[PDB]
Amino acid sequence: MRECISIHVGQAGVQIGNACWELYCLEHGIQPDGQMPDSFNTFFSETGAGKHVPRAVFVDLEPTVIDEVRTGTYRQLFHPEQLITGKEDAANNYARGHYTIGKEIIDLVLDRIRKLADQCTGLQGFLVFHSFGGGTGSGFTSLLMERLSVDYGKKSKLEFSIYPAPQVSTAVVEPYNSILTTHTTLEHSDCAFMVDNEAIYDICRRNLDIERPTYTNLNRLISQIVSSITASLRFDGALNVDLTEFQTNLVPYPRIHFPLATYAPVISAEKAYHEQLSVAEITNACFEPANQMVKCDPRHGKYMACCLLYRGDVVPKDVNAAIATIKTKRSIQFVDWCPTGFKVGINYQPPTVVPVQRAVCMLSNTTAIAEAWARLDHKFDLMYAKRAFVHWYVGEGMEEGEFSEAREDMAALEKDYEEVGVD
């Protein structure tokens, strides 16, 4: 009766969704053919025959990666009216994804939403797997979110996004993407989510015993996070926290909606022993700086709000002693005027494995993330100091002052976390 649809924008989001719906089919026992040999209306719908289809929309301006789903192993799962392709990519140009090509096939993707919104009645959240690296994953992202608040307005819109890395950075105009996309995702998204590529590597290198990771394995870490956020809807625990509450819990002021995800425990197969993984053991590893997936030191700021989504085998009194430890420390410290800073969620379902006992997803809306914007503002100034690459965005119809209008917009964003940090 309760639903939560998903949209995938750009090439980086599709390869996230290739591992996500790989995991969801293994959750409810679904085959790649939509077949299984109760309450799962959030991510699936039933046909007239005994087949289930995903509530997913795959958009791309280049026809490459969607053919990898249209010819891959997960081929028969998807409705061919969902698989939407373009012809010419934005090709790491935000003005092409926002003005040139994305304005043409915008009619088809938005029409597929209401075709999914017929059978949905408990519409409780949206999923937009979009990166800020590629132009298609960013230029279409701004055009998509404008119509939905015109469409729904009151319904929830969540973005499990990918943060551009401060050191290991692939493309060139990746600093140009973030400042331009700021005005959309601060005025439409109810709670955006930042994940950096860079912190994943040492988790793969040290904690997962494989120094040289693959992008197939980078998606496996985030796909476990997205499932355990939905662990209250898809199942039944003693304390089920639905997605309406998170945007009401984690948001003290309606502009501040940038937490970070933290999955724990992250172990290897050989290190599955030499440990016991009690509920007090693993939550201290959550607040370890080298276990999070965002390159931000949590002891460089203060926590505004914290959330903990447990699964597996959990007794709350045993967690009650675990939370009592973290308030009674000193290197871990909160925003002082928020003394009630925990949101606990327990599900009695084990964390499934993709080819352990319990697992924790930590969601901490903190002030440690605010330094990451300043590391990216420093990138954007010098490339705009030369007026470099202006003839591509202006070459694809964009105002020069539209950079400058969004330039001060980050300063009003940055002064928020500075103001909340002091008493």
């Binding site: 009766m1 089920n240 639905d242 309406t244 309606p254 939370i323 005027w337 928020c338 009630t340």
Partner: protein
Amino acid sequence: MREIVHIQAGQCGNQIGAKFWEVISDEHGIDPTGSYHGDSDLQLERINVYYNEAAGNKYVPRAILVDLEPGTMDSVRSGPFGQIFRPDNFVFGQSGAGNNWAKGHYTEGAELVDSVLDVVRKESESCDCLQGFQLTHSLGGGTGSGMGTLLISKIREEYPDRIMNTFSVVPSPKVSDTVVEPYNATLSVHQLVENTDETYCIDNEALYDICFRTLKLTTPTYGDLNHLVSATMSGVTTCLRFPGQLNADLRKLAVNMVPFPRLHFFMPGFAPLTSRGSQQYRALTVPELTQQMFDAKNMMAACDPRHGRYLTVAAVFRGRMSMKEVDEQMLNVQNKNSSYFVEWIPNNVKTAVCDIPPRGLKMSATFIGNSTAIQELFKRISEQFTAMFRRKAFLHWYTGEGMDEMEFTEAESNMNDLVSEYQQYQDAT
């Protein structure tokens, strides 16, 4: 006669009633189906007060189950004692309150309230004589905060003489399971101080403590967390459902205790409590049941009676027992803790003796306490309110529902009006 209509709300309070009606099932020999299997004919003599005897050897729980999402209603009907209820009475919404008081009281509270108030009317018409209404919910969630408090103001508009008791859990002192637990307390404080006749107040942390201090448990489940309140609620009306050497009911407990209608916020107490094997190495008699009550640790609300002053004391016993073994114990303990009480009441110990024990041990006692210790918890809660209010955070949700600061401020002032009055009689002696 004098039948009682049961209303639930929230998500915590439903699972308590999911255990509480199991307690009433074996306190009346009621099977999980709905038929009867008891042998003692004292059950059938007053069976009507918590059960409608339906047609054809049936008994249904006179209870109104209310939620705002179909999950918890599914969990009750699938597990134990779910088919015993009437499927007509599973009256529940589809949205979920979102852990917002204003969603449970203004927007989504107005929807399902009409479906409930006919069911309240259908039971109150069907009852021969009506005694009072009881409510089990939360003060931390959304559905337990707004939806239950919206009902009681409509019921006080209906019935002036009928009593009302809420077994509402106090928001937690130190652990913070709810992020907005002041915003679910303070907006719920104002409804409770106006038109609730007596109000039960249970801290979370002491319930963890009593399950750990006396019993010494390792993995306490909610089937054993919330079970202590289920025996507690049964001990309130256990003199109603069976005869005694000194009977009692919900009106006798009200007028004896509450000295002024703004001071009616009570604390429980239960005895005896043992371990699984450490149960025989103790003289489990009346003086052991005497001194097990009056200590600070037995209170399910975490408060020190040493840091406060009592006003009145009720005590409900169960099982056959003598009297001077009780009465001198119920007299002398006022003299050893002499300065802890207040001056202006002679013999503030109300005694109640039923003649039926629990299904189990031979004798049992239920303590109902009233003291000035609870107001010191609210000064923390008023601090927890103002800490999230001196920056005026979390307002745009309630602004999105529509509410001025004065409704927050006067309820905080009315919370301070509770502060100004439990301190007033405490300062007096």
